[PDB]
């Protein structure tokens, strides 16, 4: 078994044995500045990379993961060719790198486009919640309607209607828009049309926030409570239970397989078991009320009346990091792989280096990447991605930042 040298040059050896895919499979674990290397080892080594479309194959593994790569593929053409010489591929790699470098660049100083959407109406002057897309925006106005905007020429696709109060919170889905309102109700709307499916009574004061995903919804209210519903259909929806422990309005609720996190103006974030709906902890520490969380895997990020953004570990419940810089109430906030984007009362939105922030070696002052100021009133909601922020605010505008 064990008697044959430094011998084997595997990748010239294998094709010569019938077995190309193996040598290709081996090379395929390589990064580019290194696949470059294999390319240049010897002529056959070269050949295996060319005949195995090892760029195609390495660029299709990029897309199949790194958020950014799936992105640039979807946008601006080139993803057109995936899933044909092989050089087109190798030659393209440096440009996709340069892209990512210029985005992550101008996007840390100034990558504007805004595209103001002015909405109108009597009553209001506020877009409370918004949820966003590759070709539509679902927005809960204060006029009591949800307005749906075409993402391209920005026109208004559908004015949905039949809510007593301002639409305070909402969730897309690929079946049903759901909203919570000043009128103490939660609503189900078919996402294609504008048709109300179900409407839940249950609460007794402004449904302030809902979060939604999979078979169950979580919901919360000025009435101090959270309700957990397992939904069997838009038509169905049953109250699993009600969580009582907060001492004031529950401003924000959110959700993953292992925990349900809520926050109120009682200055606490409470963490509930997603399956037993029991208390587990309190995240105490904000000096004033919490206006906004997000929660993903390990992390929970909150915005406060005390003007700071806090960063928590969900398990021990420690605060990892305090973010100062907002000069007014932090009304809305979102994580992501590499950033935290928050919206304040003076209509300013701030971009934070998430990865820097999660490392205590990084000093307070340089955690806020350049700060963005294109709103007249309060910033109510935002949701972003690899290349876009798209924000609501008082001054009844949706902004689409690049």
């Amino acid at each position: 078994s064990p008697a044959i040298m430094l011998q084997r040059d595997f990748i010239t050896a294998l094709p010569a044995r019938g077995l190309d895919h193996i040598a290709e499979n081996i090379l395929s674990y390589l990064d580019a500045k290194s696949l470059c290397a294999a390319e240049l080892v010897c002529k056959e080594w070269y050949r295996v990379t060319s005949d195995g479309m090892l760029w195609k194959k390495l660029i299709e593994r990029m897309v199949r993961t790194d958020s950014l790569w799936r992105g640039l593929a979807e946008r601006r053409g080139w993803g057109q060719y995936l899933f044909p010489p092989n050089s087109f591929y190798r030659a393209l790699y440096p440009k996709i790198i340069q892209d990512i470098e210029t985005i992550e660049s101008n996007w840390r100083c100034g990558r504007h486009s805004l595209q103001r959407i002015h909405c109108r109406s009597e009553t209001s002057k506020g877009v409370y919640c918004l949820q966003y897309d590759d070709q539509k925006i679902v927005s809960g106005l204060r006029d009591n309607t949800i307005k749906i905007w075409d993402k391209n020429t920005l026109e208004c696709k559908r004015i949905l209607t039949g809510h007593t109060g301002s639409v305070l919170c909402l969730q897309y889905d690929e079946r049903v828009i759901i909203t919570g309102s000043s009128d103490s109700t939660v609503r189900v709307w078919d996402v294609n049309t504008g048709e109300m499916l179900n409407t839940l009574i249950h609460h007794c004061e402004a449904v302030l926030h809902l979060r939604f995903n999979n078979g169950m919804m979580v919901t919360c209210s000025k009435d101090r409570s959270i309700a957990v519903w397992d939904m069997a259909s838009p038509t169905d929806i049953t109250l699993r239970r009600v969580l009582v422990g907060h001492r004031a309005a529950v401003n924000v609720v959110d959700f993953d397989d292992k925990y349900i996190v809520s926050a109120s103006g009682d200055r606490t974030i409470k963490v509930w078991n997603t399956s037993t709906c029991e208390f587990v902890r309190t995240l105490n520490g904000h000096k004033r009320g919490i206006a906004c969380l997000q929660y993903r895997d390990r992390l929970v990020v909150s915005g406060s009346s005390d003007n700071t953004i806090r960063l928590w570990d969900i398990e021990c419940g420690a605060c990892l990091r305090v973010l100062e810089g907002h000069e007014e109430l932090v009304r809305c906030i979102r994580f992501d792989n590499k950033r935290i984007v928050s919206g304040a009362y003076d209509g300013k939105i701030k971009v934070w280096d998430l990865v820097a922030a999660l490392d205590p070696r990084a000093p307070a002052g340089t955690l806020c990447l350049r700060t963005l100021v294109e709103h007249s009133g309060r910033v109510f909601r935002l949701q972003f991605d690899e290349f876009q922020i798209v924000s609501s605010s008082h001054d009844d505008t949706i902004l689409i930042w690049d």
């Binding site: 204060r142 109060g165 305070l168 000043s182 302030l208 001492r247 401003n251 103006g265 200055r267 009320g289």
Partner: peptide
Amino acid sequence: YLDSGIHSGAT
């Protein structure tokens, strides 16, 4: 006006 959608503490 605060927001109809957020409320601080106590009552």
